[PDB]
Amino acid sequence: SADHSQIAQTKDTMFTGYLDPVQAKDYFAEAEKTSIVQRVAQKIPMGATGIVIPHWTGDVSAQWIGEGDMKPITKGNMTKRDVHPAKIATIFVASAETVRANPANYLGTMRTKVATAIAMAFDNAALHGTNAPSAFQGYLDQSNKTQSISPNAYQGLGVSGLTKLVTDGKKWTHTLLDDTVEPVLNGSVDANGRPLFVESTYESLTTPFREGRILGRPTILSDHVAEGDVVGYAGDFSQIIWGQVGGLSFDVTDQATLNLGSQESPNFVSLWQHNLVAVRVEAEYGLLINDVNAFVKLTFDPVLTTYALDLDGASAGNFTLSLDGKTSANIAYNASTATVKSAIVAIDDGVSADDVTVTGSAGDYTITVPGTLTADFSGLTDGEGASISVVSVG
Amino acid sequence: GFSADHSQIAQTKDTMFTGYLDPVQAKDYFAEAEKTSIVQRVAQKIPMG
Amino acid sequence: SIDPEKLRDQLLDAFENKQNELKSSKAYYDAERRPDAIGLAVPL
Structure with missing residues (x-):
């Protein structure tokens, strides 16, 4: 067929070592990246229709009056905001005999790899906004607040950072930190040089790096929260809601046709005539941040x-x-x-x-x-x- | 009457109640019944391949 | 209900077309000149 193509798997170079005394799975591959926002924001039921969030707003009031003063009149008020889902998707393609062989369990492994990529795309769309669909309302980096944590974290988080939240009348309920933060917590010292976040003789891992709370607030850790120059967040994570209209929904064909090119300039290939199998994947997330100003960005x-x-x-x-x-x-x-x-x-x-x-x-x-x-x-x-x-x- | 969202009175027409009090979906009371063939009713059927 | 003089003609035309299948089975149980049986090497 279109052998060794960039777009399909065909006994390309990868499978040169196959069906022999190959050394099991390897000893060096890292575990698949979990999603992050999906463990800190509350999941809200989402229909394919989207949802309406109502909100009270009216400044209804009462007045002090003397005896025989005629009593005042007032009116409440309400408002509404809509939220919609957005789709994320991908396709992957392999020769039908490659699917029969399933070399290095590739057609199984691929289903895990696309799931990770789709999870990562949601977190990138929520945290930094990198490719976010127009239906997603707000992303964490859109906040108008920032704080440094370099000399020690305690002054950075519990004193300065919290001041920048409570001065705006917005509270602190969680903090979210990237693994690259560990040196500045380990280096957070008193004037004598004793660490703040770990106890004497120093066997234990540093407190927030066990997902322990800092000053009452839970700590959430991650291996991939950092981007640009931002290493984490502190804020009211109750202000975030997300949903999913349905599951990752793998589907498969030996018989359809794919455009390997573009809408502007096609390059059609029949899956039947070239004898290829294709897998189709989609998920239908949705997101709303009530107020992006409720978060302090943390900077190293x-x-x-x-x-x-x-x-x-x-x-x-x-x-x-x-x-x-x-x-x-x-x-x-x-x-x-x-x-x-x-x-x-x-x-x-x-x-x-x-x-x-x-x-x-x-x-x-x-x-x-x-x-x-x-x-x-x-x-x-x-x-x-x-x-x-x-x-x-x- | 009073303004479309008057400052001192609550009314069904107020903007504040959009997304509530929506009109109920009915059946079509004027559904014109589908036409059907007269030729297939008058003409003699024969088998075919 | 259904018109019985319509049913008469309608079923009679259903029967009379059906008989053509049956002739193709009769032609094996008693030996008619089937067209496919003719040995092709025999001269005309």
Whole structure:
């Protein structure tokens, strides 16, 4: 057939050693990566229809009154938000006699490998957002908060990091850490050089690295949480919900036709005429994070943060930037790149003209800054639909 | 009456109650019955291959 | 109900076509000139 093709398995190079005294399974392969978000977010029942989440909102109230003062009138209020599933899928192909032989158990092994890849794709879509389908609402890296943990974790998590949550009125309930964090917990020392997170004579593994709690909150460990320059998270993991409409749903054919090319330029091959078997796999996840601001990103040493500022349609009035809660003077939607830089460094604390950076044209600014950045657009008299987001580490 | 979502009164038409009080799905009371062949009713059937 | 003069003609046409199968079985139990039996080497 189309022998040794990149797209099908055909007694390619891999099976040169087969059906002889080959040394069992090998002694060196690592175990399959478990999903992570699927063990920390609550699973919510999801139909193929998607779901509606209701929410109360009305600021209903009562007033103190004197005798004979006529009593006031009030109204409650409610609102709703929709959530939809999204599909993830793959196909793999092998010669029918390769399926009969099943060399190195490949057609069995492949079903485990695709399951891992599909699990990993969900966690990447939830944590860093790398390829997330448009139906997924929010991802953890989209948070406007960050903290360093380098000199010792205790000050980093229990004091500084928690301050950046409770100042926003958002609580801390779990923390999620990558294996690469172990040296900075082992290196977390008092002034005498005794470790904080392990006891005398040092036989035991360091407390959070046994999934022990830190300051009451459970620790969740992982081998693959880290990306870019972020090594973990702390926050209210009750703010995340996920679902799955159905299972991984393996299906198989000896008889269909596949396009090995693209929709734009096809390259059809019949599975029947070339005598190939193909397996079809799909899963139908869904996700909602109620508020991405409820999480502190953890960083292995100090970083800058960078934001995209969007004034699309802004046509009258002024907007207000704020750094760690300290408001700038107001800015016009038409203002220059250097005007925005001069305004943010005019906040009364810690900022400087040599550390802060601003780039891009009027109304489309990008801001790079040593802190949490927030914006009030309510001074725009016309052209609502303005927004702000994080976009990378600085 | 009062505004479409009045500030002091709750009403069935208020935006606040969208996704509740939806109209019930009925059967089609005006289902026109399917036509069927007259030729196959008048003409003599014979076997075929 | 069903029209019995329709059933008469309808079943009579069902029967009369069916007989053609039966002639192909009669032609083995008593020896008619089956077309497939003719020995091809014999001259015409």
